[PDB]
């Protein structure tokens with residue numbers, strides 16, 4: 165009758181910041197304390213420090229090598245002589261977010277108390293969120309700063325005519341900063357609302373539906389939005405110069421680290437004023453470079469909406485890659501294609517964040533997220549070196565971030581923390597170089613019915629990655645899957661039955677010295693060294709538990 169693993173954890177173990185620069189001290193908080201307990205600090209399965217669990221609050225200076233993930237696990241020796249993991253936390257030592265981005269958002273900037281904002285940022289911190297997209301903070305797409313640099317409006321009305329407080333924006337930036345997170349301001353690349361100044365943005369800058377500059381292209385918005393959004397040509401230099409100035413104004417008032425560039429995606433066949441093809445995917449590269457040039461110390465990320473623009477922008481000055489995923493990219497195998505493709509487009513230079521809104525249909529109404537839906541999709545994304553923008557004040561159910569129709573159960577919260585712990589702790593193995601492989605792995609007891617990736621409903625999918633001298637094997641469990649659509653749009657996906665103590669046979673040519681297992685579903689993701697035999701090319705071992713996602717590491 166065991167509860168889910170995350171939920172069984174006797175201790176909640178937390179750290180003060182989301183991430184740490186080399187040389188910065190990690191301060192831990194445990195919610196409760198147990199006798200006869202030892203803290204193990206691990207790097208890639210290896211214990212690098214042991215110390216007595218001696219109280220609720222203590223510090224650790226991590227090794228200074230940059231871009232390293234660690235797992236911290238606390239072990240109690242029970243009176244029978246068995247050991248229990250009480251709790252675990254992952255730690256990212258990164259000088260900068262761009263290598264291993266864990267992106268979240270914020271969506272409400274009105275009169276929210278400091279203590280309320282604090283609780284929001286603290287929560288994100290515990291997911292190790294290392295940067296935040298500030299969504300619909302801006303006054304206007306064509307003028308994101310309300311007021312002047314000299315005299316910034318303290319209170320402005322947003323695109324749905326709600327109040328935004330300068331102090332709330334500044335406050336959240338400061339709070340994210342205090343947790344080692346980056347703050348990225350949302351705007352479109354090319355957005356104009358109907359109150360823009362026609363002396364500053366001229367007819368010649370707009371994108372049109374026809375070749376005779378008759379009808380302007382636009383994002384149609386109903387109530388409560390104040391305006392439809394007109395579209396300019398991102399390659400037009402006057403627009404680039406205009407928005408560069410708007411950006412500087414923002415940066416002079418609000419200490420954003422950079423600009424989240426949004427777009428509306430493929431607009432079909434649309435034209436410049438002169439009747440020429442606006443071909444927007446090939447306009448974005450010049451736009452990115454102009455924006456970077458105008459503020460070289462400020463970060464840029466740009467959303468390739470369903471991969472529109474991705475190939476064209478992947479070699480520009482973007483911190484990492486971002487894809488909002490839509491039809492027909494609805495299969496699990498389509499998420500991994502997007503990740504494979506982004507690697508290729510960036511020549512293996514940039515990792516990806518996926519904006520991939522879960523339980524999308526369900527979210528038309530108040531409800532709960534379907535926990536197994538969310539977990540299985542993040543198991544796939546994380547196993548394949550992806551990252552998921554999904555968490556702010558609430559978890560995203562729609563492309564309109566303020567939509568908060570769906571809530572997360574306490575069970576999902578607990579589990580998802582272990583998932584973010586997992587993908588932080590083991591980032592070096594998930595998305596830090598190496599080549600995908602196709603391991604020859606077989607059940608030795610018939611408890612598992614194994615296939616390769618991409619997955620089949622009814623089967624455990626095995627996929628491998630060669631990372632340095634290590635062979636990694638991910639098991640992702642579709643045994644009980646009733647759909648291979650990642651979005652679980654109606655919240656129908658099944659919880660996988662636990663498989664326990666499952667014999668595996670693996671062909672591995674080289675000598676094996678150590679095999680270890682880690683699963684976010686087992687012991688908080690703590691690395692567990694496995695017994696094994698090796699006979700020529702043939703390694704045998706047993707995995708303790710597969711539910712959604714287990715990782716086996718052969719050294």
Ligand SMILES: OC[C@H]1O[C@H](OC[C@H]2O[C@H](O)[C@H](O)[C@@H](O)[C@@H]2O)[C@H](O)[C@@H](O)[C@@H]1O
Pocket residue numbers: 300305323351352355383385386393426562563564
């Ligand atoms: O669900 C409401 C609304 O959400 C999105 O549109 C509003 C969105 O439009 C652009 O992205 C602007 O730059 C943002 O400031 C706005 O929040 C959907 O696109 C739309 O279909 C939907 O009605």
Ligand SMILES: OC[C@H]1O[C@@H](O)[C@H](O)[C@@H](O)[C@@H]1O
Pocket residue numbers: 189223224225226
């Ligand atoms: O145990 C030696 C030292 O280890 C470091 O990692 C901790 O940050 C110190 O507080 C401690 O005194």
Ligand code: NA
Pocket residue numbers: 183256257258260261262264265294
């Ligand atoms: Na980081």
